[PDB]
Design a protein around this ligand. Structure first.
Ligand code: ACH
Lengths: 48, 113, 34, 100, 54, 5
């Protein structure tokens, strides 16, 4: 049981690392998506 | 008839358990089918802007609703796959979602343990 | 997905990865472990 | 662009009957609107011929009414584009990220 | 042929609805649901026998 | 391979 607990702990660490990578890239993609939509879809409102 | 049949499946995603691992399939399929039918109808009618067909207005409204449902399904899935090793439940979350809101909806949590 | 399905039987976590992605980045992103 | 083909300015000359294109009996289309429609008188020389050939050129400035293509292209595109970031909030256990 | 296709699409839509309901029933545990006595007496005794499930 | 066990 002790060995199982240690291995489960390491797997949990890997899972948390994956979650953190998802969160950072979610931040970046939200920023890029909003910035790009404003940059490339603002001009269309200007002309129309 | 195809549009009505597709639109009748829009609400099914909210009765599908998070464990089956198939919410995304259903909601994405509904959205894409509605989009295809909207495109077909656009091909049929003249490309004029004096008024919008009622059927097209309905399909567009349903598409907005299904996009909202996809977002909500993603959030529900994220909530469902949470553990003490990664997240913490705030006390307000308990007092609300485990006590009050279930009572309003006639849910009656078992709380056997 | 590749990072998530790692186990001690298949991989070893570097010390710097542990340090960074359990101390620095999580705080910078306003997320804290239990 | 309208003009005489075989008669130079010294033989046939064009006169603007009136600047604006007449739209009194126009049949509105529902997709475009004529913002401006003006005829301009010009003369120019051609490498074919030693004389000056006049012409009147009409420019039709037409504006598109955007509701149709808005509804049928733009908003479906925005609704699909709103889902691009959701994959990063989807847990890895649910087994549906690649699908989305 | 079109009439047959329509009829079958209606049936398949009904099957999708029923499959959502069946999946919902399948993923039930005491931690979240309690089985009513009528559910027991019907679905574990009577209907299975009618269907030769044993 | 770690081959711990
Ligand atoms: C003389 C003659 O036929 O000219 C034709 C070409 N154009 C219209 C440029 C003068």
């Amino acid at each position: 049981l002790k060995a199982e607990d240690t291995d489960f702990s390491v797997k949990e660490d890997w899972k948390y690392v994956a979650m953190v990578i998802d969160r950072i890239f979610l931040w970046m993609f939200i920023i890029v998506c909003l910035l790009g939509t404003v940059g490339l879809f603002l001009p269309p409102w200007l002309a129309g | 008839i195809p549009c009505v049949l597709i639109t009748s499946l829009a609400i099914l995603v909210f009765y599908l358990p998070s464990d089956c691992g198939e919410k995304m399939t259903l909601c994405i399929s509904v959205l894409l089918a509605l989009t295809v039918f909207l495109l077909l109808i656009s091909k049929i009618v003249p490309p004029t802007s004096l008024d919008v067909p009622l059927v097209g207005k309905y399909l567009m409204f349903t598409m907005v609703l299904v996009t909202f449902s996809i977002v909500t399904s993603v959030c529900v899935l994220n909530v469902h796959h949470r553990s003490p090793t990664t997240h913490t439940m705030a006390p307000w979350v308990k007092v609300v979602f485990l006590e009050k809101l279930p009572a309003l909806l006639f849910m009656q949590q078992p709380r056997h343990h | 997905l590749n990072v998530h399905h790692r186990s001690p039987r298949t991989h070893t976590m570097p010390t710097w990865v542990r340090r960074v992605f359990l101390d620095i980045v999580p705080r910078l992103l306003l997320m804290k472990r239990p | 662009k309208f003009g005489s083909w075989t008669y130079d300015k010294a033989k046939i000359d064009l006169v603007n009957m009136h600047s604006r294109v007449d739209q009194l009996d126009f049949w509105e289309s529902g997709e475009w609107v004529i913002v401006d429609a003006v005829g301009t008188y010009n003369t120019r020389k051609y490498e074919c011929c030693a004389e000056i050939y006049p012409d009147i050129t009409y420019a039709f400035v037409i504006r598109r009414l955007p509701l149709f293509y808005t509804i049928n292209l733009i908003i479906p595109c925005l609704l699909i584009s709103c889902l691009t970031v959701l994959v990063f909030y989807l847990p890895s256990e649910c087994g549906e990220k690649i699908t989305l």
